Amino acid sequence: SFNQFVDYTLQDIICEDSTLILEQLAQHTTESDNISRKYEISFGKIYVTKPMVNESDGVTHALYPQEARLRNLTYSSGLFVDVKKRTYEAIDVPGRELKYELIAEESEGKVFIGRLPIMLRSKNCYLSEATESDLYKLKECP
């Protein structure tokens, strides 16, 4: 269930509410400002890191479940999504239907959105690929 959720369900949740469109009305007292701006923020592919921890001084290193159990940390990994910013503008002529165009500010760009706790021995955890000797090296019970 956790491997299904990480591999497939996370992207499905991201893609369900991916596009966030904001339309700014012209609010033009004079006809010199007859432009309407349409700003769109769209989430793309989601990325997940290996389990890791950021400490007080900002250093981020790989976190193993033995250390996370001892140091009372959370065995979690970062989630990164691709965000593309779309900027659409059109001439606000009343009566005429607005036809938006890009101003070529299509900036895109992984952004950190949070830490997903990783269930042990799942595909994201370090212990999945570990052999018995590797588990003994990490002080984990095989």
């Binding site: 596009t19 966030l20 469109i21 904001l22 339309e23 700014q24 009305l25 609010q27 349409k38 769109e40």
Partner: peptide, 11 residues
């Protein structure tokens, strides 16, 4: 007086 900005439900 008119609302400057609004949410557009993408479809």
């Amino acid at each position: 007086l008119r609302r400057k900005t609004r949410q557009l439900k993408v479809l």
